């Protein structure tokens, strides 16, 4: 009862029938996997910048 093993026919047609369009980039990408040193500093720097802008705005 031997049969067909592997075939790549029609696969590209299915993919391009619903195409590969894009990974949908955004502004502010995720910080998953960046260095924790300077990630903590990023947290504190953004907190300080927000406080400074609020204090200058009054």
């Amino acid at each position: 009862a031997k049969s067909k093993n592997h075939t790549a026919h029609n696969q590209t047609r299915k993919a391009h029938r619903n195409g590969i369009k894009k990974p949908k980039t955004y502004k502010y990408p995720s910080l998953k996997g960046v260095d924790p040193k300077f990630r903590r500093n990023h947290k504190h720097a953004l907190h300080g910048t927000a406080k400074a802008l609020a204090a200058a705005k009054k």
Binding site: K14, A15, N18, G19, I20, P23, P29, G33, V34, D35
Partner: peptide
């Protein structure tokens, strides 16, 4: 490049698997 560390850098590459592109770090 998205991350810069002691001796390496982290690179985001789009690769095509299935009917979609995936981001790889």
């Amino acid at each position: 490049v998205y991350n810069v560390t002691k001796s390496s850098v982290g690179v985001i590459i789009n690769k095509m698997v299935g009917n979609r592109y995936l981001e790889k770090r």
